[PDB]
Amino acid sequence: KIPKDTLIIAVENEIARINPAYSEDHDAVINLVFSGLTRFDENMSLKPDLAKSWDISKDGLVYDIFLRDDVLWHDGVKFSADDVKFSIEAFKNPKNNSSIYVNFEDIKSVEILNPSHVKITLFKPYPAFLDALSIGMLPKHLLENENLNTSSFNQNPIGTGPYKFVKWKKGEYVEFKANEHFYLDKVKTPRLIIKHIFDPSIASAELKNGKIDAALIDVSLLNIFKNDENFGILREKSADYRALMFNLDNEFLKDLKVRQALNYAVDKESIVKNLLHDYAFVANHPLERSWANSKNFKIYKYDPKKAEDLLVSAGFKKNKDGNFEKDGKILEFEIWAMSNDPLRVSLAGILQSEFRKIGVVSKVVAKPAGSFDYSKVDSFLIGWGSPLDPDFHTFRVFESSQDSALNDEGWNFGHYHDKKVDIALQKARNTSNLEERKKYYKDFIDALYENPPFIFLAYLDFALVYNKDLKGIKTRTLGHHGVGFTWNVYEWSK
Ligand SMILES: O=C([O-])C(=O)[O-]
Ligand code: NI
């Protein structure tokens, strides 16, 4: 049995470089080792962390940030303004190829005015900046002469976070020990292990045979825990959605009428009702848990007749087999799903069924996450979503310059290029006035409807399943893959 002083938590995704500069919002380990200037509480409220306070100028261009003087890095060295300037400059240096480059490109200058005071000046307003500064700070004294891209640091990280790095068995687990000088509070469980388990049926089994203490578990597997008193189940809300990603390079899917038709073809109400057992709600756009949600937008209602009318209009005709065809080619394409994710496999199956009903042929291809290039398939059962500022999973996902065929750190895997979307997100992220921001996000949402990059399917709840001995777990609004479910792990204990 797992000792009382050890926490073992399963997490779906890992990261090859435990370094805030390469955060892709998929891991649970950078936030153990590192901490940022700001943080969020159970209500997703912005709170001071490494920074004690801050003032922003009326024009939104200047940030005066005041730091704690009582923080140590894991190696004993004090945390100073030196680190903060090194870090922010590090994220916006193009030679570092940072995954969060777009969160810091707008910084013009970082001035250290006293050892606990930095003055950050921006080219244009970027209200998302304080959310952005929740990213971990890096240690200047260890990395200032390093190649941030390849440094051995990335596999031996030193941070200011609640947990010190111990060892790493690649592909299997990372092991940590409590930071006994953690400025924020005392870490309760001295030993913590994050186990890499990307298939929930395997996670489920390891809960049952006592190999792990906690995991997020797909709704399809919850039945074997609902009547087991040895476990609790915490339902967590999230901003995470699932969708069909259209690859716009595909000869059929590039066509606006075809993409609209495929949207009209899917009975989303039936999916959420039946597959997801109301651990989900129907999705239509990517900001429906945001303040940025326009709440009055157009949608593609389930309408098979309209789908067919659209495909006729696009020049297709049902052949003798009942399949839409144009110029000797039937309208067909592949739908790819992560085979280790039962929800996505089920969804790819349902889409294939829905399309078949209107004479669209498709092939489901299920392969393990990480084993194929998601930007090189006709379509992909994709997911994104962040409870933080609406910029964070929209700019890298939809904007043209973030097309991943051009931008190694872009998340626009479908190669989507829309002028109204580009303009809307750019204005939205660089305007200070909240009401103005909402206006631009409405333009963005409306533009997405007119030129849909996806079929949006559903927003997910997550089920945190945990050994009943576990105390201290707090919920909050999770992100994509349920990331964030370990946000207060330093308060957890047995
Ligand atoms: O992050 C993604 O690409 C996903 O999970 O679909
Ligand atoms: Ni993902």
From TrEMBL:
GO biological process: peptide transport
A Pfam family it matches: SBP_bac_5
Official protein name in the record: Peptide ABC-transport system periplasmic peptide-binding protein
UniProt cross-references to InterPro entries, sorted A to Z: Peptide/Ni-bd, SBP_5, SBP_5_dom
Binding locations of Mg(2+): 31
Keyword tags: Metal-binding, Signal, Transport
GO molecular function: metal ion binding; peptide transmembrane transporter activity
Domain of life: Bacteria
Residues annotated as domain Solute-binding protein family: 46-399
GO cellular component: ATP-binding cassette (ABC) transporter complex; outer membrane-bounded periplasmic space
Gene3D superfamilies: Dipeptide-binding Protein, Domain 1, Dipeptide-binding Protein, Domain 3, Periplasmic binding protein-like II
Family the entry assigns: Belongs to the bacterial solute-binding protein 5 family.
